[PDB]
């Protein structure tokens, strides 16, 4: 039924601007308001404003006046939000939402640092009886990466540790625990995907 499709993630220099979209489908676009919400660190939520779709009128949160500009394209069933004079404080996940359904969110990173592909190193036991393996994803930018173990066959016994900052770049890791029977008799592989740099790294962990 109702669905809001948001534009992809953004990496923008400080001081520049950016416009993200919110395509609606499955209902009459002119009948319902489209709100824009900012979420900080996946927790704190802030309402930015909504736009009268037919008349184009907009109701703003005063704290976002001069920072956000809400528009609509009635023809394409799309709502737009433009953020001006970006600073690192504007780095957040931005949602567009009807009263009924929310969009999947648009991640915005405001930084002068450029897209950095990750270094991937295996984590194998040195020189009972479950064996924990891992892969260290170090020095990438920006978020995010996805570590897939054995094409997804191993999912229940996986720990994805959230990324932290290290020397201005992100570092994360991922563990998998398997029966000592499984490895190294059978192959265990981590697949690191970093879409921002169009990179996929596959590591076959060796004893």
């Amino acid at each position: 039924e109702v669905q809001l499709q948001q534009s992809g993630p953004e990496l923008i220099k400080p001081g520049a601007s950016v416009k993200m979209s919110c395509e609606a489908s499955g209902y009459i676009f002119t009948e319902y308001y489209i709100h824009w919400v900012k979420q900080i660190q996946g927790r704190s939520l802030e309402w930015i404003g909504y736009v009268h779709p037919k008349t184009g009128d907009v109701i703003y949160n005063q704290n976002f006046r001069g920072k956000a500009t809400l528009t609509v394209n009635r023809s394409s069933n799309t709502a737009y939000m433009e953020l001006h004079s970006l600073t690192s404080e504007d780095s957040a996940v931005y949602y567009c939402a009807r009263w009924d359904s929310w969009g999947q969110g648009t991640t915005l990173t405001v930084s002068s640092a450029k897209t950095t592909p990750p270094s991937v190193y295996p984590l194998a036991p040195g020189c009972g009886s479950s064996v924990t393996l891992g892969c260290l994803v170090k020095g990438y930018f920006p978020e995010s990466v996805t570590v897939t173990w054995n094409s997804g066959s191993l999912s229940s016994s996986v720990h994805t540790f959230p990324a932290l900052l290290q020397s201005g770049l992100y570092t994360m890791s991922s563990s998998v625990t398997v029966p000592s029977s499984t490895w190294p008799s059978q192959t265990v592989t981590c697949s690191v995907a970093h879409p921002a740099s169009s990179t996929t790294v596959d590591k076959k962990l060796e004893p």
């Binding site: 924990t132 540790f161 994360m172 890791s173």
Partner: protein, 218 residues
Amino acid sequence: DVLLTQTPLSLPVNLGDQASISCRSSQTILHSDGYTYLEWYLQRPGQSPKLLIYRVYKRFSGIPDRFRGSGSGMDFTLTISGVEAEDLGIYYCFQGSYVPRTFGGGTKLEIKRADAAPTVSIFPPSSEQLTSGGASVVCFLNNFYPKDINVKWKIDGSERQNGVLNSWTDQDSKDSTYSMSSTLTLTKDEYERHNSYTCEATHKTSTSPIVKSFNRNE
């Protein structure tokens, strides 16, 4: 602006028991049209917020009857009875009676379980890594409960604090445990001037720490 304050910040609860979340506003949410536009949202990890309750009590379509909303004026309550495993997440209250519209800070529901000691695995720096001039020693502390835990690194028997970075997972959705990763990053030169590297996990499941170490010469 109207401020929404939720209590508690974190709600540990057993499965099948009743959880209650408070939402207090600095001003009355009763609008001039006679309606009270207070809503409740749930955000599971990795997902967008989903609507649970609107206009104080009205359940959204597809929301089970164990979620109940109540209140008026400046005091509102979300009750869950009884808690299921899929209810894990953060619950927000939201008012739409004023401009600007404001959210509560969020209440993190937490599933209680029996105490579990962490499983500690230490990993020497990969040989692939030493070509870059640096060395990261990784220590995994997986599947422990409760979430409060302490990691201490030792190099040749002496505590090391410089170069330690830690990351904590959210509560696991299947076994309700927590995991943690600790990384000691040194230069290659310093890493090779020392022999034994130790990862010590201090957890309430024992008055003594769990010690996992390795000797670089082995």
